[PDB]
Structure to design on (1738 residues):
């Protein structure tokens, strides 16, 4: 779960070989579906996402 | 905004627990309705709530069924015997010790 | 719009009574104005009687140490009052003919 | 509907289709001739001046509304207020003054009446217990008046809180088992009148106003009682469909026809319960139910 | 009777010069806190109405008039020295009341509401 | 507990940079930004492993049941 | 989740036209007219009568919730399909709601424009004895916001007064689930055995 | 007790050991807090369950919950019957006793029939509603009880009928028993030998009853957070301890009488007969108190004031630290209400602003009932000095109540802690309530404590019954705000808050309306509802569901875990502090107890194994120890 | 001293009996003795008007100052939200959401038209 | 049917109360049963089956 009520079950452990990579070379730890967000309306998770990235940089 | 994480203050506090008043004082205030309320049983004005409470339920009295065989009067009928007035005027909680 | 004050008497000149509304007290009988003494403190006790109405009075344990009431005496052609520290006596009226009481128990 | 098959529905209604010649103006006049009127609903104030001496007297004075207010809102003439206050109301008030006495032993003024007003009062003094005086506004209907006298043996009575309770009980004009009639908005062109309470025997005499061949209740035990068992079956499938269509849920009519044909299988209105199960053959279905 | 000690009886009182007139002596009743001393003052400057404010020893007051049951009592003659002042019950004539006030400050709306 | 051996997301060995990072902040008096960039951490997946670590083993080692008092 | 600089200016103008709306519906139900001021001592007498009666209060709530919901749907009709920054063949929040993938356009409009009236038990926000709906507001405050109208949105955040009213509507949807865990268990059981 | 975090470590505790709980047979239990009625304040309540009691009972009635100084409660209810009769209801030993008022009014002091008249009719002589109800109360006594002419003869009657259940001894006369019935039951917050004050309050409660049946007063809501307080965990533990020693003194007495119903040997001056009884008397009180803390069941031969006998205690849980610290801020309405069919007690209300959290309430069946306290909400444990306040109100415009006789809603009854002290006008009451607040926060007054709440209720048309109620007792919810002149801190309770204007931010202060401002708008949330990042961007059920899901994470219970033997613990291995965090995360010391772990999260639909709930963890991140626990 | 229908005593304040309800020309006080056998005191008139919630009616509701009834069709509740109608031709459609789930799912919108009035619901 | 001790919590429910309840015998062991050759488990999504 995150701190916004976006809980969910681990449906599959997915290997790094076929998990999407970036320009930087970062496979994400957690993929969350975008179809969670339109009805739950946790936009605190959309601003925690870009504020943790700025803070880790 | 600038809301730092205290990474040199944490490690200096995990290694050395303070020898004075605790850091994080708002965590003591979150149980003040519990710790302070048990404290009022044996502290505060009138000696605490327990000693102030044992004098609201004061006396418990009985008499005899036995007579004195006094002067054969209405005072003989007006005599029940002798009377307990068993009461409790102090209650004290002791800090926990061990007996052996 | 200004008024001067001639006298203020420490000694008990006047009293004031808080009896019930519509209280009359026919004019034949007088009262008794006592005073409590514990070496510094001042609490008035009232008492009076006739053939039916025995009726005492006493002050209040809160207001007399704090709220003092004063009785004044004015006339607009004088532009003057004089004052007296007059206590306010809370009073009740008992009757002599209603002081009966039954036995102390069921007696049976 | 499905469970308990009650004859006491909480909110039974009746839907009354109106004709073509009767307009919405004349339908609103018609709803005022069915909806019940309490005598409470035409009173502005009640002044009760209690006096003692002589016999404790009780002067009950009733401020009504304006005559062109309660004979517009309620369609009650001031010749109908007289026939309720004199005939019905005082017997109810004197029933409760006596019934309290059992528990008890355990502005402007007007006068100068004529012969019509005098001998009406004379009929009321002879027909009630403790009355002795009476008047009524036969000019404008704005006030009533009557002056009860009781014995001096009786103590203090809250006369207003008896008048407040009897005025809220005295009906002026109630068609029975019907409280209220309303003119709602016409959906699908259906000009209807909705009636809080079921009495088909009353609405049949309103045939100049109401299409009597198309009136329909929701109380199935009443439609069974008056229009047979096939009309009660129709009332079931339209009152289950109104439950589901209100929440925009669609079920097929094949499922609703099969439930109304199971409830009305004995010519009655059987619930789905223990008591409607008694008319059945298999004993293990009964043992395994409850 | 027989009330306990402390309760001393008072055989003699001072004099209150009222005659039950008829000009007439307006009998008053006024109310004071224990903050103020009446003997250490000499004047009660009061208006015709309640719009009053006196200042004794840097404690601001306001002298309310609440004239519109408390019974007066005068000394009988000398012996028991208390009788009800009455002509035939009786009432007072102008009843004032002094109450302590305090100037609350207005809110400083240029320093407490920061943008 | 102790600093993880490897970063979770990339896989750089990060376990050798916790006692280095604490001496960069204590003695060099750097900020956390430059002290992570001096240690060769430059992916934000790999920054937060040293940046955001609690190191609670120092609080667990205070409870030694083998040593007196 | 973002509007463009012109479409953000649109809703700033339309929500500026709601500062009078709470008084206009207040001045209607009291049967005053011609825009009496808000602190008028004769309006405050009439609003206090409305509060002490349960029927008259729902009439105030039904006139005002029909006027601020006019202002709500004027913003959404101006800003949601047209006043955005990224549009539908790249905007995922609009594409997920137009396709019926997840959510509706009510959800998209609360993220992007405004939440709106927070309606409670089929009425408006409940109000104290003192006329107040929160200790922040004035007693008998004729305002849309004082009655529980949120001109904030989930993209920019909601104010602490209107964060508190939105928590009220969030809980009445959860106490109904507290009383809805099995309503129709014995109805279906008793149907399935007669018709078995 | 007073022991350093260094020395808590040297004695096998956590360094910030929290306290506040009991250890009972290894299980680590605490006492739930309860929401109960506010003490010493009469509540004009309509209730449909008053006509349950039978004939002529109306739906009206005043109710006061009066507590003694030992925090023991005694509820009196003052009914109104439709016949004009007004009764008095109380309880004693689980039994419920209905009595007339003018037998209790006339046993308190020497009462005339104007003193009972003028107490209720100060003015409003010409209010014909109200002077007619009064002679169904003055004739209805003198007709029904025609042999009670003074105080020491109505005490004979009231001590005669109440002798058995009060369990008196045969030496006590009829008026000694009837004085016990007035000392032990009616209005016990005014003490014993406080009958002059018990008489003025019953007059106040009769007219407030009559002002409620006239429609002049709105019925006070018992479920609305201003007319209610918090029964603390330690005060409940002392109410039952007083009852357990009361059973002890009666079990001695029952054991002596079993020796005189046989006649073995009795000398009550003897030292060795006293010891012979107490060998057989169960004097182990302390295991009966442990039985309360073991099961929560309230066993009481008397019967306390409360309305249930089960579930007073809970297990303090260490599934993480957020679950543990939220037991101590949790308050409960009652277990009487979760059984109900009506869900209006569960409603979030504006009177809880700053005192209960709007977010932090459990999803499901206890929703609305098991809500948590706010951030800076404190509770009065001791009571402050109320001795100097009456001497100050007399210095202000108050007329003393002993010689005023001026009841009504047209005047402002000034009270402290349920003691009626005087009467003012409504114009003068607002000035007295404003200067008492100005004298309070500026600490130059010797006798005004800052936790004194000043509850002025201004007059209205058909609103709450007006007054100037002041409170200083125990168990009161309190919170801080900023008082706008002098900028200091003021302490405000929920009875005050309904009539006070308290701005949220300093940018919303408006001229001549706001007198207070919040310190921070975050003081109204919980602890755990205030750690949710950017919570004003989420939807409200998602902030409420986080408070459920945040308690149930596996994180760090503690660090002293090798000296504990709990039934089960959940411990996540490598926690991290958050990058994105609130400032209160550091003030509550949450770095000691890491709840989770930062993660690179890609909001993407890529695999097809994730819809609405389901998520995709990285395999290699897991193998490198991501979210591992034991 | 007479207060309405109540007359109290004059020196002890006790309540005198009802002078018409005593036996033949004899009253007295019972705390003290205040003998008045010939019943000096006059008619004791108490006028009592009922309180105006004792008779609720629609005509009294029209005697109010504030609006106590909305009209028949003069409150349409915001009839202009764009929604693609299922049945015939409408662009605009009223909506209403209600929450049903236990804080682990969102809400779902109802739909009632403004041109045909077709009650309707959409999953997403 | 039987009063007996009348202290509460009556033991030995008898051969009627073994048949009449929601559980009884006739709804917990006849109209519903427990089965062999069955399993239950948590379910998880898959688009490839």
């Amino acid at each position: 779960s995150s701190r916004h009520g976006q809980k969910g079950v681990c449906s599959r452990k997915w290997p790094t070989i076929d998990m999407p990579f970036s320009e930087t070379g970062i496979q994400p730890d957690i993929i969350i579906n975008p179809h969670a967000f339109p009805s739950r309306m946790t936009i605190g998770m959309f601003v925690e996402s870009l504020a943790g990235k700025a803070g880790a940089l | 905004r600038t809301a730092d994480f205290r990474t040199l203050e944490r490690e200096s506090r995990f290694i050395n627990p303070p020898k004075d008043k605790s850091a994080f004082p708002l965590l003591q205030e979150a149980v003040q309705p519990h710790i302070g309320s048990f404290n009022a049983l044996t502290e505060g004005p009138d000696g605490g709530l327990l000693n102030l409470g044992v004098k609201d339920i004061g006396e418990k009295v009985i008499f005899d069924g036995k007579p004195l065989n006094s002067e054969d009067e209405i005072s003989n009928s007006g005599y029940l015997g002798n009377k307990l007035s068993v009461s409790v005027e102090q209650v004290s909680i002791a800090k926990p010790m061990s007996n052996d | 719009s200004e008024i001067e004050i001639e006298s203020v008497q420490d000694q008990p000149s006047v009293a004031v009574g808080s009896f019930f509304k519509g209280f009359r007290a026919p004019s034949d009988t007088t009262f008794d104005l006592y005073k409590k003494k514990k070496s510094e403190k001042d609490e008035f006790v009232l008492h009076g009687e006739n053939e039916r109405l025995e009726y005492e009075g006493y002050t209040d344990s809160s207001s007399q140490a704090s709220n003092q009431y004063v009785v004044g005496l004015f006339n607009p052609e004088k532009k003057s009052i004089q004052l007296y520290k007059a206590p306010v006596l809370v009073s009740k009226v008992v009757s002599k003919s209603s002081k009966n009481l039954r036995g102390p128990k069921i007696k049976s | 509907i499905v469970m308990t098959a009650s004859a006491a529905i909480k909110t039974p209604q009746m839907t009354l289709p109106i004709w073509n010649d009767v307009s919405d103006e004349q339908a609103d006049t018609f709803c005022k001739s069915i909806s019940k009127v309490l005598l409470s609903e035409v009173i502005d104030k009640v002044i009760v001046t209690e006096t003692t001496g002589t016999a404790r007297s009780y002067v009950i004075h009733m401020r009504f509304f304006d005559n062109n207010e309660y004979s517009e809102e309620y369609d009650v003439s001031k010749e109908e207020l007289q026939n309720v206050i004199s005939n019905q109301f005082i017997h109810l008030l004197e029933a409760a003054i006596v019934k309290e006495i059992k528990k008890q032993k355990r502005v402007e003024a007007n006068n100068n009446m004529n012969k019509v007003q005098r001998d009406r009062q004379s009929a009321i003094i002879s027909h009630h217990r403790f009355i002795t005086k009476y008047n009524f506004d036969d000019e404008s209907g704005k006030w009533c008046e009557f002056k009860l006298e009781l014995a001096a043996d009786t103590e203090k009575l809250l006369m207003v809180n008896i008048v407040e309770e009897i005025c809220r009980k005295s009906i002026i004009r109630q068609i029975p088992h019907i409280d209220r009639c309303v003119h709602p908005e016409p959906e699908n062109g259906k000009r209807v009148l909705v009636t809080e309470g079921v009495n088909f025997q009353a609405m049949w005499d309103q045939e100049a106003f109401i299409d009597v061949d198309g009136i329909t209740s929701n109380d199935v035990a009443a439609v069974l009682k008056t229009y047979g068992v096939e009309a009660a079956r129709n009332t079931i499938v339209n009152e289950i469909n109104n439950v589901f269509s209100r929440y925009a849920i669609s079920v097929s009519f094949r499922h609703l026809d099969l439930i109304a044909d199971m409830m009305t299988r004995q010519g009655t209105y059987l619930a789905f319960n223990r008591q409607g199960m008694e008319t059945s053959t298999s004993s293990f279905m009964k043992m395994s139910y409850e | 009777f027989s009330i306990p000690d402390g309760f001393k009886k008072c055989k003699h009182l001072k004099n209150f010069p009222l005659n039950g007139d008829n000009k007439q002596q307006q009998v008053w009743l006024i109310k004071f806190p224990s903050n103020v001393d009446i003997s250490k003052l000499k004047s009660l400057p009061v208006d015709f109405e309640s719009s009053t404010t006196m200042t004794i020893d840097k404690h601001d007051y306001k002298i309310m008039d609440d004239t519109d049951n408390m019974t007066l009592l005068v000394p009988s003659e000398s012996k028991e020295s208390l009788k009800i002042a009455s002509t035939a019950p009786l009432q007072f004539d102008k009843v004032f009341s002094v109450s302590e006030t305090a100037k609350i400050p207005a809110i400083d709306y240029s320093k407490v509401r920061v943008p | 507990m102790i600093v993880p051996v490897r970063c979770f997301s990339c896989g750089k060995v990060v376990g050798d940079k916790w006692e280095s990072y604490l001496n960069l902040l204590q003695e060099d008096e750097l900020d956390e930004g430059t002290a992570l960039s001096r240690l060769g951490l430059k992916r934000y997946c790999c920054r937060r492993m040293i940046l955001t670590h609690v190191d609670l083993i120092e609080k667990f080692l205070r409870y030694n049941p083998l040593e007196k008092r | 989740l973002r509007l463009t600089a012109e479409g953000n200016k649109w809703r700033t103008d339309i929500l500026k036209t709601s500062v009078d709306t709470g008084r206009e519906a207040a001045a209607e139900v009291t049967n005053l007219d011609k825009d009496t001021p808000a602190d008028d001592p004769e309006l405050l007498k009439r609003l206090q009568e409305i509060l002490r009666d349960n029927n008259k209060s729902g009439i105030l709530d039904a006139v005002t919730s029909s006027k601020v919901n006019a202002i709500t749907s004027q913003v959404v009709s101006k800003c949601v399909p047209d006043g955005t920054m990224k549009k539908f063949p790249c905007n995922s929040m609009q594409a997920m709601a137009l396709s019926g993938a997840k959510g509706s356009n009510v959800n998209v409009s609360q993220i992007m424009c405004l939440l709106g009236q927070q309606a409670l038990e089929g009425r408006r926000v409940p109000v104290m004895v003192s006329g107040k709906t929160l200790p922040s507001f004035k007693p008998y405050e004729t305002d849309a916001m004082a009655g529980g109208y949120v001109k904030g949105r989930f993209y920019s955040g909601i104010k602490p007064q209107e964060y508190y009213f939105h928590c009220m509507a969030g809980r009445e949807g959860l106490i109904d689930t507290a009383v809805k865990t099995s309503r129709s268990g014995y109805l279906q059981r008793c149907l399935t055995k007669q018709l078995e | 007790n007073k022991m350093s975090p260094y020395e808590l470590v040297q004695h096998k505790e956590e360094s910030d050991e929290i306290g506040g709980y009991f250890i009972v047979n290894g299980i680590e239990k605490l006492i739930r807090m309860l929401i109960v009625q506010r003490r010493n304040h009469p509540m004009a309540i309509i209730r449909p369950s008053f006509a349950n009691r039978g004939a002529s009972y109306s739906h009206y009635g005043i109710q006061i919950r009066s507590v003694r100084p030992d925090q023991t409660s005694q509820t009196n209810v003052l009914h109104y019957l439709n016949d004009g009769q007004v009764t008095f209801r109380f309880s004693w030993r689980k039994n419920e006793y209905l009595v007339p008022v003018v037998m209790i009014l006339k046993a308190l002091c020497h009462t005339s029939d104007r003193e009972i008249f003028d107490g209720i009719i100060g003015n409003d002589v010409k209010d014909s509603f109200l002077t007619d109800r009064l002679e169904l109360l003055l004739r209805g006594f003198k007709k029904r009880y025609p042999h009670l002419q003074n105080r020491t003869q109505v005490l004979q009657y009231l001590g005669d009928k109440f002798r058995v259940v009060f369990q008196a001894s045969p030496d006590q006369s009829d008026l000694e028993v009837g004085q016990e019935v007035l000392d032990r039951i009616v209005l016990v917050h005014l003490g014993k030998d406080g009958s002059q004050d018990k008489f003025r309050m019953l007059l106040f409660m009769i007219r407030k009853l009559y002002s409620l049946v006239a429609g002049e007063c709105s019925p006070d809501n018992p479920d609305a957070t201003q007319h209610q307080e918090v029964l603390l965990g330690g005060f409940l533990y002392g109410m039952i301890l007083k009852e357990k020693i009361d059973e002890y003194l009666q079990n001695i007495i029952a054991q002596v009488r079993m020796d005189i119903n046989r006649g073995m040997a009795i000398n009550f001056k003897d030292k060795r007969y006293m010891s012979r009884v107490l060998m057989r008397v169960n004097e182990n009180i302390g295991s009966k108190m442990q039985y309360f803390l073991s099961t929560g069941n309230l066993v009481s031969q008397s019967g306390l004031d409360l309305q249930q006998v089960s579930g007073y205690t809970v297990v303090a849980e260490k599934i993480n630290f957020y679950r543990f610290i939220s037991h101590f801020r949790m308050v409960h309405r009652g277990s009487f209400f979760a059984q109900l069919k009506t869900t209006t007690v569960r409603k979030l209300l504006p009177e809880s602003w700053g005192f209960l959290c709007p977010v932090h309430t459990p999803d499901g069946s206890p929703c609305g009932l098991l809500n948590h306290f706010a951030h800076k909400c404190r509770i009065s444990t001791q009571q402050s000095d109320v001795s100097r306040i009456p001497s100050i109100l007399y210095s202000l415009g108050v007329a003393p109540a002993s010689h005023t006789f001026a009841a009504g809603p047209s005047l402002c009854c000034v009270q402290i802690d349920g003691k009626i002290i005087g009467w003012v006008s409504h114009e003068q009451g607002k000035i007295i309530a404003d200067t008492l607040r100005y004298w309070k926060v500026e600490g130059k007054t010797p006798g005004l404590p800052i936790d004194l709440e000043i509850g002025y209720v201004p007059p209205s048309t058909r609103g709450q019954y007006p007054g100037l109620y002041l409170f200083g007792g125990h168990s009161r919810m309190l919170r801080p705000v900023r008082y706008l002149p002098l900028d200091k801190e003021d302490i405000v309770g929920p009875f005050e808050q309904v009539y006070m204007n308290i701005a949220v931010t300093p940018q919303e202060i408006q001229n001549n309306v706001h007198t207070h401002v919040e310190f921070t708008p975050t003081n109204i949330l919980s602890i755990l509802a205030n750690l949710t990042p950017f919570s004003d961007f989420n939807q409200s059920p998602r902030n409420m569901y986080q408070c459920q899901m945040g308690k149930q994470t596996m994180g760090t219970p503690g660090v002293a875990l090798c000296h504990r033997s709990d039934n089960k613990l959940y411990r996540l291995q490598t926690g991290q502090t958050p990058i994105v965090k609130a400032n209160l995360y550091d003030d509550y010391g949450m770095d000691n107890f890491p709840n989770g772990f930062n993660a690179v999260v890609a909001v993407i639909s890529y695999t097809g194994y994730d819809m609405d709930d389901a998520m995709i963890i990285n395999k290699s991140a897991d193998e490198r120890g991501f979210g591992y626990g034991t | 001293s007479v207060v309405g229908s109540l007359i109290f005593c004059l020196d002890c304040g006790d309540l005198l009996e009802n002078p018409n309800a005593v036996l033949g020309s004899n009253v007295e006080c019972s705390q003290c003795k205040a003998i008045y056998p010939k019943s000096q005191f006059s008619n004791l008139k108490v006028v009592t008007t009922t309180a105006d919630d004792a008779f609720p009616s629609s005509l009294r509701a029209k005697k109010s100052v504030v609006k106590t009834s909305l009209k028949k069709n003069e409150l349409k509740d915001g009839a202009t939200i764009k929604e693609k109608c299922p049945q015939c031709g409408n662009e605009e459609m009223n909506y209403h959401t209600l929450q049903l789930r236990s804080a682990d799912e969102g809400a779902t919108v109802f739909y009632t038209c403004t041109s045909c009035g077709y009650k309707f619901r959409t999953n997403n | 049917k039987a009063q007996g001790r009348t202290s509460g919590k009556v033991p030995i429910p008898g051969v009627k109360q073994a048949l009449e309840k929601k559980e009884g015998l006739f709804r917990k062991h006849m109209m519903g049963k427990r089965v062999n050759y069955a399993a239950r488990s948590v379910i998880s999504p898959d688009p490839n089956i």
Remarks:
- Chain F has four helices and no strands.
- The radius of gyration of chain F is 14 Å.
- Chains F and I do not touch (no CB pair under 8 Å).
